Amino acid sequence: KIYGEYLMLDKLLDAQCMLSEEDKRPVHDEHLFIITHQAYELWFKQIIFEFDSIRDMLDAEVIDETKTLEIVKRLNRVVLILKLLVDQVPILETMTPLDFMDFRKYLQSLQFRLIENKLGVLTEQEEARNSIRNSEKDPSLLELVQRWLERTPGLEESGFNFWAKFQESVDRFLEAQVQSAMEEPVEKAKNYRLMDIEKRREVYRSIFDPAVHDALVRRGDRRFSHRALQGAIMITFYRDEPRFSQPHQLLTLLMDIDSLITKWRYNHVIMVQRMIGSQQLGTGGSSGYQYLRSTLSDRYKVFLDLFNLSTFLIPREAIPPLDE
Amino acid sequence: KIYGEYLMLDKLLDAQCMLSEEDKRPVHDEHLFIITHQAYELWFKQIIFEFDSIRDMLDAEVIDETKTLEIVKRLNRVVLILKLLVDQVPILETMTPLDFMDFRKYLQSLQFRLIENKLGVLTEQRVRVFSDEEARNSIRNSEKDPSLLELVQRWLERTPGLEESGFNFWAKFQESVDRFLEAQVQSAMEEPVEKAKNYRLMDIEKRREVYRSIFDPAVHDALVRRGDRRFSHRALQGAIMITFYRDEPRFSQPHQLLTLLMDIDSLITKWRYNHVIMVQRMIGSQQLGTGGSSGYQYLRSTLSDRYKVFLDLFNLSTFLIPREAIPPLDE
Amino acid sequence: IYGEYLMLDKLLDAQCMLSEEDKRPVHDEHLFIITHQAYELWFKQIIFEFDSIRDMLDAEVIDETKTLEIVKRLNRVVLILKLLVDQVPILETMTPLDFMDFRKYLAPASGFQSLQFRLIENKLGVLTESDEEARNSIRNSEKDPSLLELVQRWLERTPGLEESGFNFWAKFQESVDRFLEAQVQSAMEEPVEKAKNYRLMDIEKRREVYRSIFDPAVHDALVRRGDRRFSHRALQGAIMITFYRDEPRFSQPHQLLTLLMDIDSLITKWRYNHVIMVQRMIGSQQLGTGGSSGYQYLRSTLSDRYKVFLDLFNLSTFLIPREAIPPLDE
Amino acid sequence: KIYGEYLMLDKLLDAQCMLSEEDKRPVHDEHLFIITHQAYELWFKQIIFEFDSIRDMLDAEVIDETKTLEIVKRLNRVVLILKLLVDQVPILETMTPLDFMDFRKYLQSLQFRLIENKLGVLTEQVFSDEEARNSIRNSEKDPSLLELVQRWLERTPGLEESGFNFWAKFQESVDRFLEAQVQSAMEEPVEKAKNYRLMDIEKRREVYRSIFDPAVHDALVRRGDRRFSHRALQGAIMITFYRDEPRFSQPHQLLTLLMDIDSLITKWRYNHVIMVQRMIGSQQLGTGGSSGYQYLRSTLSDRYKVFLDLFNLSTFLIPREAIPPLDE
Ligand code: HEM
Ligand code: HEM
Ligand code: HEM
Ligand code: HEM
Ligand SMILES: O[C@H](c1cccc2cncn12)C1CCCCC1
Ligand SMILES: O[C@H](c1cccc2cncn12)C1CCCCC1
Ligand SMILES: O[C@H](c1cccc2cncn12)C1CCCCC1
Ligand SMILES: O[C@H](c1cccc2cncn12)C1CCCCC1
């Protein structure tokens, strides 16, 4: 009921134990190290709580406008929490490498891994063991978003039939581009345009040929199923329409989360290099540092497909108009 | 020690208990409410830890360049932590007023008060408390033991350059002001435009009134009693001196210390403002249970300069004279 | 052609240090010019966005598609304002003595400092309590409908307010009456006498709150007094949107109100940051200031007299629980 | 004298020309595109101005505590300007890819290149104007911040053999420290821990070989892993060891701000490359493949980090009690 009892500050403000102070050789900056890590872990619990509720909302065959708005609110909340965590790195960077060296002797996160897994970081790229097992077995946000995207209204052949209208629009647009390039007076400009239209033909081949798409998914360049990519492309085309404005905001927030997780990884790896360099006494070489540098690759970006959707764009007047 | 054992996550990640979930009427945003408050309390413990160490360092007759640098490191760390706490308000603002209304039924901080007291928020300024004996002892000690405001004043009073036998800054400053203002009167007398001439002469008179408030200790003492100033006359002399020679290596780090104290003060007001806007967005000026707009109006009164601890430091630029008017450093 | 497109031969030719001209150069004068010109470029952008939002609101029909574009442009202004608040610490890098060495070349302003800053204040809807092109600009910004006036007209036409249709205001008054009656009966059953009286005193405070909105004469008195700006029907529409903000129909109109409040808050955050910088550079008064009159004027701009959408901030005072709010039928 | 005359707003507020509005097919977001770019260019002119003054201050045989403080003020100012410019990307990201596509038909920076060159981005890792050609020529010929910082680092007091002789004392401290570590690892009761420590001490010996053998350092400079001269790296290491001492606190802050500038230029490059992919993808109509996008992704590599050596200085650190104490 009262502030301290409600927030359980007798439990929370009792979890700070400096091992340098315990060994009667105290290092002042060890308190900062503990608090910073515990602030991260509190916000990790919050991110997991939000993610689990969004997963339960996405694990339904019908996701109405009302549930969609609540998913957008919670994805945006996670975006704000991630920005706060990126800003916590410069606070720990206040500690000197020599101060850190004086308590390092007494020294990853279950919650960070649960976030990676629940978001959709692919594994091929006892209470704690059960938690990690369930986070890999149960559907991630990447899987649940794909199923949502696959059921996007406008994709069905009987209804709006977007993919078929898009292939036809592309064909007529590229034909008009070839005729325009043929009328180019300068020969150099004419050839540049014709070579460019050929590059466009290759781009559309990667989406209009399911075999080419499946090859890229197996290769690791794509994660999304063919139909989820169709739904994602459709939403990006009609994002200015009220029907698709909120679904697009959902995709946008997923990309913002992905980008912010990489911004944390980068800020963390720069802090590691400022504190202990590429290697230091106890590191056993630069293996740990080099591992952290490999987490900055696109193999760790979950919604990798969403970032490239603008490659497939056609002008407003080339896009098939909404009928319904 | 392993990660979870070192950080005591079995204790830390077990302090979250939603009373709406307990009463089988759960409100999802109650988890956010608890975590946000607990993140504030973790950083409050950090701020207190830093403040206590800076206080212990300032509680000495000799504060060398090396201790000064460590005080600046820790003050700057607090500045970063305060910016982080100002940014936590928009996260809680994500909660809707109707969601908050559904768990408010089950509902200030000892640590926030310890920060206010240790920084130097004067007990006689608080606009119109804790039953625990450990909490009562904490608040008693924070009021009895010297605050950062008291310790900084003693440091400022002992600033080398103030002593009459040595550099004698205050006497050289009064002489510089007198000659500068006389030269301004002669320059204003040769003004061709009559309107500009009178404006300059009226302006030089406003300057004379400013210097009266610092060169007459009785006028200063009146402002301290009035509440417009907190600093002792000699601490204000030292603060003014540091701001004049801030570009000199001797005074660059002391000036950075004053600057960080002002930044902390400004950031505490930025939190107070952000908090009061969030309170109005959640429950308005008054709501069912509030018993009027008393609580909201109290929070609006904490935005006044009666709550700014290093109030004197903000005004130091009012006493500034040009580079060519300032007495040069000899030693 | 990058340089030709952006007209960098015109843009990068507008920087002239008068200290360098007088053969007594001050390095930080370049920062002073660039910082001010960065502000003025973003002021031109804010005015451009505000004028387009005003044109979109100056219509009897504002569809979902135009509403979304208004929200995009209001949010863009919110980002530009946050960026301008962050430009103050860059100018605060300059020392007061460096500033003092070039301040001589500056003129103090006859009325408003920046024409563009005043055009923003006027176009948003501030009551602010010198050339023919500039005079015409400021005249038109005061005469033509501000964002405050145009938003009020939009709020007045909110679907759900009409008596023939949903009739929200009448259902709200009835819900309040029954809610407060239930609260009185609940307070009457309180065993502790101190708690019972607290609840009955509190219900009386609530009765007064609802009197200020359910009696148009009490509302009109507060508008004349300056405590409120909104018309009675605009406040009804604003209250309605805040009650059903979780419903898709009212989620975007609520986002529009939210962004207007964010802009208002950010303009006050700039005013505060600017006033702190002024005090760090020249104090409350300095040579040329002629007393602390200019500084004290800047401190008076921090009051709620300068907040345009003042009514929107207090809307949560009128809230009733989820189960007390009349359900949406249509 | 007056506000508009002083800031030349008749010139500044007249440089905005939308080509979509000119062609009677206006795109509202083109105004944002112009203003955002012009805001970048105004701050580029400021960064160049600060860099040129810091270069003039570093182009002296004597850099006293007073000049050092002014260099730190201006480096920290550039750090704030760079943070501001990283935050301008999300404002342009407000524009939709389809709105951008409707004016892209009417469409790098001389100032961005001048910053890259003046900071020290090596040309071994386009403009036909005569004024622009002279500018880029001079930015490559005149000493960059990387060259001038190296010269300053080389003359760091405490490195001279006659004086404090830091490098010789550091080699001796390392030798005794690592020997003590071997003796301590030999007495390890657990065999797994004993072997781990001995393997680790060997990794440390290889680290110190790269700094105590000038031939190994020169090989890394030629290989591209390092840029700094051997003596500049000695000075940089020395400052990082005694950063808590008043004598070295401000020189260390200077190195720290150079790394912050480097990191912020990479944060802009990353934010810019994400915005490009959100607007036009890896390739689009007119791009002629994904060459431009792939070029921008290659600018995120450590080949574009100027003060690359400064980031790794913590690899050479020894404990407080192992560092030779300051005498003077
Ligand atoms: C003094 C500063 C820090 C240093 C030097 C540091 C160093 C390292 C190193 C070397 C690793 C690689 C794994 C290993 O070899 O053990 C690592 C991983 C990790 N650290 Fe840090 N760390 C620091 C601060 C933090 C903070 C403040 C957090 C936040 C809670 C954090 C969270 C993690 C996580 C979650 C991983 C795993 C990353 C992944 O799997 O991609 N570290 N750290
Ligand atoms: C749902 C959001 C919040 C609301 C509506 C709210 C409301 C209030 C109110 C009405 C008061 C006045 C005292 C009273 O009458 O009980 C108050 C005081 C206070 N609250 Fe908040 N609060 C919120 C969030 C927070 C957060 C996140 C913190 C941070 C830990 C916080 C810290 C405080 C402190 C320290 C005071 C005392 C301020 C002073 O003495 O100057 N509040 N709050
Ligand atoms: C060196 C820093 C600055 C100082 C000391 C300063 C000082 C002042 C003062 C004293 C006034 C009051 C009007 C007068 O009596 O002349 C004022 C007004 C104003 N200044 Fe600043 N200023 C500074 C920087 C800026 C910047 C960077 C901007 C942004 C473009 C700015 C914009 C304005 C505006 C728009 C007003 C009018 C405010 C209102 O009407 O509410 N100032 N300034
Ligand atoms: C609509 C948004 C933008 C898009 C799609 C975009 C796209 C591109 C592309 C594709 C390139 C590669 C060169 C080429 O093939 O022509 C490039 C380079 C460049 N752009 Fe952007 N850009 C955008 C906004 C900006 C902004 C706001 C600035 C800031 C002034 C900027 C500054 C630059 C610079 C300086 C380079 C060269 C980078 C380097 O040499 O490392 N761009 N841009
Ligand atoms: O003072 C009460 C409160 C309770 C718990 C934490 C907290 C933080 N700030 C205010 N807090 C308020 C009083 C007003 C209504 C909402 C609860
Ligand atoms: O992996 C170790 C570690 C231990 C404790 C907290 C923490 C956070 N991130 C990494 N942490 C590192 C390994 C390298 C030296 C320093 C301890
Ligand atoms: O290189 C072109 C360009 C032109 C103008 C400004 C600008 C900023 N960054 C890149 N800019 C791009 C290239 C890709 C097509 C669209 C224009
Ligand atoms: O009114 C003067 C002024 C002139 C030029 C730029 C500017 C910005 N804001 C105020 N400015 C003030 C008056 C007081 C001394 C400092 C300049």
> Does ligand 8 have an atom closer than 6 angstroms to the CB of C113?
yes
Per the CB < 8 A criterion, the answer to whether D274 and D266 are in contact is no
Chain A partners within 8 Å of D101 (Cβ): 313, 315-316
Chain C residue nearest residue D92, CA to CA: C76
Whether residue A35 is annotated as binding a ligand: the answer is: yes
| Residue D290 maps to a domain | yes
Chain C touched by D17 (CB under 8 Å) = yes
Find all residues with CB under 8 Å of C56, minimum gap 6, and list them: C62, C66, C69, C70
Query: For residue D272, how far is its CA from the centre of ligand 4 (angstroms)?
Result: 7
Residue D98 structure tokens: 């389809």
Q: Which amino acid is at D65?
A: E
Q: Which residues of C are part of a known binding site? A: 32-36, 103, 274, 289
Q: Indicate the SS3 state at residue C102.
A: coil
| Residue D26 maps to a domain | yes
Residue C312: CA atoms inside 13 Å, Cβ hemisphere, count? 22
What's the CA gap between B156 and B160, in Å, rounded? 9
Which DSSP string do the residues of D179-247 spell out, in sequence order? HHHHHHHHT-SSHHHHHHHHHHHHHHHHHHHHHH-HHHHHHHHHHTS--S-HHHHHHHHHHHHSTTSHH
Nearest to C229 by CA among C177, C307, C292, C134: C307
Residue B25: CA atoms inside 13 Å, Cβ hemisphere, count? 9
Q: Which amino acid is at D145?
A: L
Residue A153: CA atoms inside 13 Å, Cβ hemisphere, count? 11
Q: Please name the member of C68, C69, C248 whose beta carbon is closest to the beta carbon of A69.
A: C248
CB contact under 8 A, C83 and D80: no
Question: Resolution of the coordinates in A?
Answer: 2.5
Per the CB < 8 A criterion, the answer to whether A175 and A253 are in contact is no
What's the CA gap between A295 and A148, in Å, rounded? 28
Supply angle C-alpha A229, A231, A232, rounded to 5: 60
Long-range (24+ apart) CB contacts under 8 A made by B163-172 are B166/B331, B167/B329, B167/B330, B167/B331, B169/B237, B169/B241, B169/B327, B170/B237, B172/B327
Chain A adjacent subunits, 3+ CB pairs under 8 A? B, C, D
Cα-to-chain-centroid distance, residue D314: 17
CB contact under 8 A, B84 and A81: no
Residue B48 structure tokens: 């207190």
Query: For residue C275, how far is its CA from the centre of ligand 8 (angstroms)?
Result: 12
Chain B touched by A24 (CB under 8 Å) = no
Q: What is the CATH number of the domain that holds B69?
A: 1.20.58.480
Ligand 1 neighbours (beta carbon < 6 A): A 36-37, 40, 92, 100, 108-109, 112, 268, 271-272, 275-276, 288-289, 291-292, 295
What's the CA gap between D88 and D91, in Å, rounded? 5
Residue C9 structure tokens: 């031969």
| Residue D328 maps to a domain | no
> Does ligand 4 have an atom closer than 6 angstroms to the CB of D279?
yes
Q: Please name the member of A65, A66, A242 whose beta carbon is closest to the beta carbon of C68.
A: A242
Q: Which amino acid is at C42?
A: W
Whether residue A268 is annotated as binding a ligand: the answer is: yes
> Does ligand 5 have an atom closer than 6 angstroms to the CB of B229?
no
Cα-to-chain-centroid distance, residue B98: 35
Whether residue D239 is annotated as binding a ligand: the answer is: no
* Elucidation method: X-ray
Per the CB < 8 A criterion, the answer to whether A216 and A206 are in contact is yes
Per the CB < 8 A criterion, the answer to whether D177 and D318 are in contact is yes
Q: Residue C6, Cβ neighbours under 10 Å: how many?
A: 22
Residue A55 structure tokens: 């997963």
Domain that holds residue A228: 3-157+222-312
Give the DSSP H/E element, type plus range, for residue B172: helix B169-189
| Residue D322 maps to a domain | no
Per the CB < 8 A criterion, the answer to whether C36 and D7 are in contact is yes
Residue reference for tokens 């006050």: C268
Which DSSP string do the residues of B203-248 spell out, in sequence order? HHHHHHHHHHHHH-HHHHHHHHHHTS--S-HHHHHHHHHHHHSTTS
DSSP D102: T
What's the CA gap between D92 and D96, in Å, rounded? 9
Chain D touched by C6 (CB under 8 Å) = yes
Cα-to-chain-centroid distance, residue B210: 24
Chain D partners within 8 Å of B250 (Cβ): none
Q: Any idea how long chain C is?
A: 330
What's the CA gap between C189 and C84, in Å, rounded? 56
Terminal CA-to-CA distance of chain B, rounded, Å? 55
| Residue C173 maps to a domain | no
Phi, psi of A218 (to 5 degrees): -65, -35
Q: What is the least distance, in Å, from the CA of B121 to any CA of chain A?
A: 22
Chain A touched by C300 (CB under 8 Å) = no
Chain A partners within 8 Å of C246 (Cβ): 66, 69-70
Compute the Cα dihedral for B252, B253, B255, B260 and give only its sign: positive
CB contact under 8 A, B98 and C198: no
Per the CB < 8 A criterion, the answer to whether C233 and C156 are in contact is yes
What's the CA gap between B145 and B118, in Å, rounded? 8
Which residues is chain A interrupted after (C–N above 2.5 Å)?
A: 107, 125
Calculate the alpha carbon distances from D193 to A309, C18, D140, D184, D199 in Å: 51, 70, 53, 11, 10
Nearest to C130 by CA among C109, C151, C144: C109
Continuous H helices in C125-247: 132-143, 147-156, 168-188, 193-214, 216-225, 232-243
Phi, psi of A158 (to 5 degrees): -70, -35
Per the CB < 8 A criterion, the answer to whether A91 and A36 are in contact is yes
Compute the Cα dihedral for B204, B205, B207, B211 and give only its sign: positive
Compute the Cα dihedral for B265, B266, B272, B278 and give only its sign: negative
Terminal CA-to-CA distance of chain D, rounded, Å? 54
Q: Residue B123, Cβ neighbours under 10 Å: how many?
A: 10
What's the CA gap between C308 and B30, in Å, rounded? 32
Stretch 141-180 of chain A: residues touching chain D, C-beta under 8 Å: 177
Chain A touched by C247 (CB under 8 Å) = yes
Phi, psi of D4 (to 5 degrees): -70, -30
Query: For residue C257, how far is its CA from the centre of ligand 3 (angstroms)?
Result: 29
What's the CA gap between B241 and B319, in Å, rounded? 10
Q: Which amino acid is at A245?
A: S
Helix axes B169-189, B233-244, angle to 10 degrees: 70
Give the DSSP H/E element, type plus range, for residue A161: none
Q: What is the least distance, in Å, from the CA of A65 to any CA of chain B?
A: 18
Nearest to A114 by CA among A53, A173, A48, A52: A48
What's the CA gap between B171 and B7, in Å, rounded? 57
Per the CB < 8 A criterion, the answer to whether C173 and C214 are in contact is yes
Per the CB < 8 A criterion, the answer to whether B235 and B153 are in contact is yes
Q: Please name the member of B66, B70, B249 whose beta carbon is closest to the beta carbon of D65.
A: B249
Residue reference for tokens 């929370």: A12
Chain A touched by C65 (CB under 8 Å) = yes
Find all residues with CB under 8 Å of C191, minimum gap 6, and list them: none
Query: For residue D8, how far is its CA from the centre of ligand 7 (angstroms)?
Result: 28
What's the CA gap between C324 and A275, in Å, rounded? 57
Query: For residue D243, how far is its CA from the centre of ligand 5 (angstroms)?
Result: 45
What's the CA gap between B170 and B168, in Å, rounded? 6
> Does ligand 6 have an atom closer than 6 angstroms to the CB of A281?
no
Query: For residue A54, how far is its CA from the centre of ligand 5 (angstroms)?
Result: 28
| Residue A320 maps to a domain | no
Chain C touched by B281 (CB under 8 Å) = yes
Q: Which amino acid is at D139?
A: S
Q: What number does the ligand 4 atom closest to the CA of D44 have? A: 30
Supply angle C-alpha A193, A194, A197, rounded to 5: 85
CB contact under 8 A, D94 and C87: no
Nearest to C119 by CA among C14, C19, C206, C44: C44
Calculate the alpha carbon distances from B83 to A55, A172, A212, B269 in Å: 32, 55, 50, 11
Residue reference for tokens 């260390």: D252
Chain B touched by A105 (CB under 8 Å) = no
Long-range (24+ apart) CB contacts under 8 A made by D193-201 are D196/A284, D199/A284, D200/A281, D200/A282, D200/A283, D200/A284, D200/A285
Q: Counting one residue from A and one from C, how many pairs have CB atoms under 8 Å apart?
A: 16
Query: For residue B275, how far is its CA from the centre of ligand 2 (angstroms)?
Result: 7
CB contact under 8 A, D284 and A310: yes
Chain D touched by C47 (CB under 8 Å) = no
Residue reference for tokens 């201050």: D57
What's the CA gap between C232 and C213, in Å, rounded? 8
Per the CB < 8 A criterion, the answer to whether A305 and A232 are in contact is yes
Query: For residue D41, how far is its CA from the centre of ligand 7 (angstroms)?
Result: 15
Nearest to B118 by CA among B150, B89, B94: B150
Q: Residue C227, Cβ neighbours under 10 Å: how many?
A: 14
Per the CB < 8 A criterion, the answer to whether D90 and C76 are in contact is no
Take atom 16 of ligand 4 and give the residue whose Cα is closest: D292
Whether residue A104 is annotated as binding a ligand: the answer is: yes
What's the CA gap between C327 and C168, in Å, rounded? 10
Domain count across chain B: 1
Q: Residue A139, Cβ neighbours under 10 Å: how many?
A: 15
Instruction: Give the mutation candidate from C11, C48, C68, C105 for the D interface (greatest D CB count, under 10 A).
Output: C11
Compute the Cα dihedral for C203, C205, C208, C209 and give only its sign: negative
Residue reference for tokens 């389809």: D98
Give the DSSP H/E element, type plus range, for residue B153: helix B148-157
SS3 content of chain B, % helix, strand, coil (to 5): 70, 0, 30
Nearest to C120 by CA among C308, C310, C311: C308
Cα-to-chain-centroid distance, residue B48: 14
Long-range (24+ apart) CB contacts under 8 A made by B226-231 are B227/B125, B227/B306, B228/B311, B229/B311, B229/B312, B230/B120, B230/B122, B230/B149, B230/B309, B230/B310, B230/B311, B230/B312, B231/B153, B231/B156, B231/B312
Ligand 3 neighbours (beta carbon < 6 A): C 35-36, 39, 91, 99, 108-109, 113-114, 117, 274, 277-278, 281-282, 294-295, 298, 301
| Residue D187 maps to a domain | no
What's the CA gap between C17 and C15, in Å, rounded? 7
| Residue D177 maps to a domain | no
Phi, psi of D41 (to 5 degrees): -65, -30
Find all residues with CB under 8 Å of B160, minimum gap 6, and list them: B166, B167
Rounded to the nearest 10 degrees, how much is the dihedral formed by the CA atoms of B173, B177, B180, B186?
A: -160
Chain D adjacent subunits, 3+ CB pairs under 8 A? A, B, C
